Amino acid sequence: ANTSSAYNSVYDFLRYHDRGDGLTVNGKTSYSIDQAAAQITRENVSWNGTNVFGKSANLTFKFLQSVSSIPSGDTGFVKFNAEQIEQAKLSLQSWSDVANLTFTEVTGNKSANITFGNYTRDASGNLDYGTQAYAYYPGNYQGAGSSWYNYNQSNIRNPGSEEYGRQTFTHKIGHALGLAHPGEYNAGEGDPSYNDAVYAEDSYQFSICSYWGENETGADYNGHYGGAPMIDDIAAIQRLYGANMTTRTGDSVYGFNSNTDRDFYTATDSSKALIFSVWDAGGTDTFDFSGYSNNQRINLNEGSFSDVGGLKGNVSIAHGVTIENAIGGSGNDILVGNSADNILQGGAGNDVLYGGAGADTLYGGAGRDTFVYGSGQDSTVAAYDWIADFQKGIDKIDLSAFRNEGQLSFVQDQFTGKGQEVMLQWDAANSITNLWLHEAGHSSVDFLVRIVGQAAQSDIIV
Amino acid sequence: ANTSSAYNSVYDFLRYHDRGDGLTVNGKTSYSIDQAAAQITRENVSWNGTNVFGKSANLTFKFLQSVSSIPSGDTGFVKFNAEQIEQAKLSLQSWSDVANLTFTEVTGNKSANITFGNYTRDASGNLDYGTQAYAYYPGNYQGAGSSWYNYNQSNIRNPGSEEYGRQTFTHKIGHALGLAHPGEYNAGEGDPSYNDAVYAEDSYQFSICSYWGENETGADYNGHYGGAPMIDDIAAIQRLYGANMTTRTGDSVYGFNSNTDRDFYTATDSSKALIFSVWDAGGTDTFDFSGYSNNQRINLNEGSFSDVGGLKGNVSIAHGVTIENAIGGSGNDILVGNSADNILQGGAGNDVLYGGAGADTLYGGAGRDTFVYGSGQDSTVAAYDWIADFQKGIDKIDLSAFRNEGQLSFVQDQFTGKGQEVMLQWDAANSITNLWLHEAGHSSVDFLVRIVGQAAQSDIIV
Numbered sequence: 001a002n003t004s005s006a007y008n009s010v011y012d013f014l015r016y017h018d019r020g021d022g023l024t025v026n027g028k029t030s031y032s033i034d035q036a037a038a039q040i041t042r043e044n045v046s047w048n049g050t051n052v053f054g055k056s057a058n059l060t061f062k063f064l065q066s067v068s069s070i071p072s073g074d075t076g077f078v079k080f081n082a083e084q085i086e087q088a089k090l091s092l093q094s095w096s097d098v099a100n101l102t103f104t105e106v107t108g109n110k111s112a113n114i115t116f117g118n119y120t121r122d123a124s125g126n127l128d129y130g131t132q133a134y135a136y137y138p139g140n141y142q143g144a145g146s147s148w149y150n151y152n153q154s155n156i157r158n159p160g161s162e163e164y165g166r167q168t169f170t171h172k173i174g175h176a177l178g179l180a181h182p183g184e185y186n187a188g189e190g191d192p193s194y195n196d197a198v199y200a201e202d203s204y205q206f207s208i209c210s211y212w213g214e215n216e217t218g219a220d221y222n223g224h225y226g227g228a229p230m231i232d233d234i235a236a237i238q239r240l241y242g243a244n245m246t247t248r249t250g251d252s253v254y255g256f257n258s259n260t261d262r263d264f265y266t267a268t269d270s271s272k273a274l275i276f277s278v279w280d281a282g283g284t285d286t287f288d289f290s291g292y293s294n295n296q297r298i299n300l301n302e303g304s305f306s307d308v309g310g311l312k313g314n315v316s317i318a319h320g321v322t323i324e325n326a327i328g329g330s331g332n333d334i335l336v337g338n339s340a341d342n343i344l345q346g347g348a349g350n351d352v353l354y355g356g357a358g359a360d361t362l363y364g365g366a367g368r369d370t371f372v373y374g375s376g377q378d379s380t381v382a383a384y385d386w387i388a389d390f391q392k393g394i395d396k397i398d399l400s401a402f403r404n405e406g407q408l409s410f411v412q413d414q415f416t417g418k419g420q421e422v423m424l425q426w427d428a429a430n431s432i433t434n435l436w437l438h439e440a441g442h443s444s445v446d447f448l449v450r451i452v453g454q455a456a457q458s459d460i461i462v
Numbered sequence: 463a464n465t466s467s468a469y470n471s472v473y474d475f476l477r478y479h480d481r482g483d484g485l486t487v488n489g490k491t492s493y494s495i496d497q498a499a500a501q502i503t504r505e506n507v508s509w510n511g512t513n514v515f516g517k518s519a520n521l522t523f524k525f526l527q528s529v530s531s532i533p534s535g536d537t538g539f540v541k542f543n544a545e546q547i548e549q550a551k552l553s554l555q556s557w558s559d560v561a562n563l564t565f566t567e568v569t570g571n572k573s574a575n576i577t578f579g580n581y582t583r584d585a586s587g588n589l590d591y592g593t594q595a596y597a598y599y600p601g602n603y604q605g606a607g608s609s610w611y612n613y614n615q616s617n618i619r620n621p622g623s624e625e626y627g628r629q630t631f632t633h634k635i636g637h638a639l640g641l642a643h644p645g646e647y648n649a650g651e652g653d654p655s656y657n658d659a660v661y662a663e664d665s666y667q668f669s670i671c672s673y674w675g676e677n678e679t680g681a682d683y684n685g686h687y688g689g690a691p692m693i694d695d696i697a698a699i700q701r702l703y704g705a706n707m708t709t710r711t712g713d714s715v716y717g718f719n720s721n722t723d724r725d726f727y728t729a730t731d732s733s734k735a736l737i738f739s740v741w742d743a744g745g746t747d748t749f750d751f752s753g754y755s756n757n758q759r760i761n762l763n764e765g766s767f768s769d770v771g772g773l774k775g776n777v778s779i780a781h782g783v784t785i786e787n788a789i790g791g792s793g794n795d796i797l798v799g800n801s802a803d804n805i806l807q808g809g810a811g812n813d814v815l816y817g818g819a820g821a822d823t824l825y826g827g828a829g830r831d832t833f834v835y836g837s838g839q840d841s842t843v844a845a846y847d848w849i850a851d852f853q854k855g856i857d858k859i860d861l862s863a864f865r866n867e868g869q870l871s872f873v874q875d876q877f878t879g880k881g882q883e884v885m886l887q888w889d890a891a892n893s894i895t896n897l898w899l900h901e902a903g904h905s906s907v908d909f910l911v912r913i914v915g916q917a918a919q920s921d922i923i924v
């Protein structure tokens with residue numbers, strides 16, 4: 001089966017960052033999402049106790065205004081400033097969006113599950129401008145749930161403008177909810193590296209609690225830091241506390257023209273860098289990546305990674321989530337849909353669209369676009385695709401995957417019954433071309449793509 | 463796995479009239495839809511010639527006003543009366559709805575592909591009140607396409623009021639389009655019977671061109687005759703001429719409150735008998751069987767048969783068709799959905815609803831209703847069911863299918879991790895109960911049913 005390069009680019013992108021299933025990546029063992037999640041929850045502790053899973057929690061948090069001591073022995077306490085308060089609340093919300101958690105602020109003398117405070121000096125009273133931050137697991141002991149940040153670091157004081165600050169807040173709150181570093185190390189013990197990782201997917205691409213940069217797994221965020229839980233963090237936190245099924249249950253738009261009211265899902269112009277793993281609990285949803293000019297690769301399959309706005313591996317979709325639609329930008333893109341009915345819009349540029357299973361509606365947009373079919377099940381009669389903007393002599397429909405069972409032949413107006421034949425039928429009253437494919441092994445003609453517009457035999461790649 | 467009687471009634475109804483696949487039914491070989499279709503098209507002739515498949519046709523028809531002779535040698539020509547003209551046009555439309563055919567009437571001296579005329583006497587000139595009707599295959603010979611009906615039969619003169627007349631018209635037009643009797647016999651040659659059938663599905667339940675009554679295969683139309691192509695006729699006619707993808711591509715309602723403008727799909731009150739195989743080429747469609755009080759069984763799977771309004775095996779869905787929604791009546795019904803997102807409404811009575819795969823929305827209605835789940839894939843987190851009218855202490859949710867992998871246990875607020883556990887979670891802010899099931903072999907909790915209302919542990923059948 002010598003397939004086309006368009007089909008091959010689909011086949012390959014579908015397998016981008018494959019994981020688990022006895023693979024080995026970077027010479028390391030590969031963990032599935034669930035295995036990573038179990039690893040990141042290995043301490044088996046949460047605010048509900050030890051070995052307690054799937055249980056929701058209503059927690060309190062507090063910005064300490066003074067302290068009698070700090071449990072690590074650091075000193076020079078300094079309270080949260082206004083920007084730190086707002087970003088920390090944004091991090092909290094990023095967790096509660098995905099797991100069944102509620103956060104309620106307390107003040108005064110009230111105790112709280114999670115606290116926030118800065119330090120500036122060590123126990124000897126000397127200025128500390130080297131460290132970053134740390135936090136304590138849930139539990140009943142003194143300091144359980146407390147998180148502490150080095151105020152002499154500008155990223156900690158200005159986390160709204162220095163991405164590592166917000167990231168750090170999300171990470172440390174994670175530990176305070178019960179999550180661990182994917183690998184058994186802790187900042188300040190020798191000189192560990194990614195080579196020390198237990199599993200390949202121990203990196204920022206997969207967990208915001210990882211020690212290691214996204215580059216260690218092949219992703220590239222161009223110097224930016226994602227500020228929200230990543231795919232393995234979502235599975236992990238949900239393991240402890242349950243998934244939040246009330247989040248964004250309407251028709252949700254992620255990227256440009258977003259209606260999320262979440263900074264990490266929202267791009268207001270082309271310079272914005274998106275780094276997120278999406279959680280969405282209902283409705284018909286869209287990845288609008290329309291404002292970028294880079295060549296992008298957008299995959300709608302749950303658990304899968306995309307390359308958006310010039311970054312690599314920066315967008316993923318959490319396990320348990322179904323996103324329905326995608327819009328590329330002016331670059332030459334690949335859009336891969338999932339088993340749901342997807343609307344895909346390639347935008348300008350020469351795009352490759354693959355709707356996969358389900359009744360998909362495809363707009364190639366401006367440019368020389370290619371609509372790819374990988375199997376008879378992609379477009380059955382009972383649930384057929386529409387291609388709604390096909391341009392004869394310009395776009396292509398690619399059926400080369402079918403060569404693996406004998407190359408298709410075109411017929412003009414009738415099928416012979418031998419199978420593996422492709423026919424185009426014009427319906428003048430409606431201006432629709434029906435593309436029929438009689439596949440080997442099928443007694444009846446079971447594959448149909450309807451096209452709003454004319455198409456020529458030479459537009460069809462067999 | 464001792465499963466519940468509710469689940470068993472689903473499992474069984476899903477296999478109602480199973481066919482093909484090396485089964486033997488009534489001691490005969492069982493044909494799939496496609497095999498029956500090939501058998502019924504065995505003459506391999508159509509208006510496009512011989513051995514020509516999948517090719518559309520634009521045909522003419524004519525009500526002869528006089529004849530020089532009738533090709534069978536019968537005599538006593540009598541032209542169509544007004545009711546015969548209207549019913550014959552209804553039969554023609556029943557064929558063109560399903561296959562790519564157009565029918566245009568001609569008059570005067572113009573030749574036509576299909577003609578209609580009555581006779582009343584044999585070649586000896588004696589009155590014939592015994593025979594019924596006959597027709598001639600497409601071809602170039604004299605009489606090709608002609609159809610002829612015995613005017614001394616009241617069912618032929620009053621086909622709008624005597625169902626066998628309309629049926630006969632649909633049947634004979636079928637032969638004039640190229641279809642054959644499922645078995646090699648012809649009225650007037652000895653005394654054949656269903657025992658002579660080549661395959662089991664040679665009956666009115668499957669083909670309006672069959673010799674044999676629906677009772678021969680276990681169906682029962684209570685003395686009525688279906689007037690429209692049945693499931694094997696649809697596949698057969700489509701084999702010759704192609705499927706008509708422009709038919710009823712909007713949101714179509716079949717049964718009560720129908721918007722089809724087809725008498726055979728329309729019931730205006732509870733005494734109406736429905737007998738149809740549905741063809742539908744797009745949109746979100748409903749089987750509204752709400753006006754009956756009989757216990758009904760309604761299956762939405764393509765190719766499947768239902769028992770509607772007190773009849774058995776009287777409704778089916780053609781291959782290539784996806785119907786999305788179903789409404790039962792006041793009887794105790796079973797509604798089985800398909801892999802699509804289905805809305806099922808049980809109506810009054812004690813109903814069993816099974817949404818199958820996809821994100822289904824279920825209304826049990828009045829009565830003690832049972833919502834049945836047969837597998838983890840019926841209601842995944844990524845595409846979960848809603849039960850929107852659940853009545854605590856009255857309805858049931860049946861998870862007994864899961865016993866085949868160990869009986870589920872209830873847990874109150876947390877999962878242990880051992881799997882096969884079921885949990886109910888109340889969300890007071892929204893008044894929703896989330897039913898979670900942690901299934902054996904699943905590392906994460908992957909099955910969820912959301913319920914608009916409270917539910918008790920004792921409402922859940924494990």
Ligand SMILES: [Ca+2]
Pocket residue numbers: 247248249250251252280281282283284285
């Ligand atoms: Ca949504």
Ligand SMILES: [Ca+2]
Pocket residue numbers: 280282283284285322323324
């Ligand atoms: Ca969705």
Ligand SMILES: [Ca+2]
Pocket residue numbers: 328329330331332333346347348349350351
């Ligand atoms: Ca593009």
Ligand SMILES: [Ca+2]
Pocket residue numbers: 337338339340341342355356357358359360
């Ligand atoms: Ca799809």
Ligand SMILES: [Ca+2]
Pocket residue numbers: 346347348349350351364365366367368369
């Ligand atoms: Ca394009």
Ligand SMILES: [Ca+2]
Pocket residue numbers: 364365366367368369391394395
């Ligand atoms: Ca284009």
Ligand SMILES: [Ca+2]
Pocket residue numbers: 355356357358359360378379384385
């Ligand atoms: Ca598709």
Ligand SMILES: [Ca+2]
Pocket residue numbers: 709710711712713714742743744745746747
């Ligand atoms: Ca429809």
Ligand SMILES: [Ca+2]
Pocket residue numbers: 742744745746747784785786
């Ligand atoms: Ca439909």
Ligand SMILES: [Ca+2]
Pocket residue numbers: 790791792793794795808809810811812813
């Ligand atoms: Ca009912």
Ligand SMILES: [Ca+2]
Pocket residue numbers: 799800801802803804817818819820821822
């Ligand atoms: Ca379904």
Ligand SMILES: [Ca+2]
Pocket residue numbers: 808809810811812813826827828829830831
């Ligand atoms: Ca009911």
Ligand SMILES: [Ca+2]
Pocket residue numbers: 826827828829830831853856857
């Ligand atoms: Ca009920």
Ligand SMILES: [Ca+2]
Pocket residue numbers: 817818819820821822840841846847
């Ligand atoms: Ca379902």
Ligand SMILES: [Zn+2]
Pocket residue numbers: 171172175181209
């Ligand atoms: Zn850490």
Ligand SMILES: [Zn+2]
Pocket residue numbers: 633634637643671
């Ligand atoms: Zn006949």
